[PDB]
Amino acid sequence: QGENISSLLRELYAKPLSERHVESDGLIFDPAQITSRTANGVAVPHGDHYHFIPYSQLSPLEEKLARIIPL
């Protein structure tokens, strides 16, 4: 399972940044940096604050990885 998730995440990192989610303050979503996960989305740190990103704001691939990556 770990190897499968790593291969999928490698696939995401291989896409152009234009196809990945960016927050209004510039933060690029990275599933490997998820610190908390709920039913509506995930939390990622960004210095002195955390973002919460709803799954629906991510691409389908980004959502899949956000849901399955093991914390």
Which residues contact Zn ion by CB under 5 A?
Answer: 25, 27, 46
Between 29 and 63, CB nearer to Zn ion: 29
Q: Min. distance of Cβ 20 from Zn ion in angstroms?
A: 15
- 31: tokens are 């599933």
Q: Min. distance of Cβ 63 from Zn ion in angstroms?
A: 20
Q: Among 21, 41, 39, 38, which residue's Cα sits nearest to residue 29?
A: 21
Between 15 and 46, CB nearer to Zn ion: 46
Q: Min. distance of Cβ 47 from Zn ion in angstroms?
A: 7
C-alpha distances out from residue 8 to 12, 16, 26, 49, Å: 6, 15, 24, 28
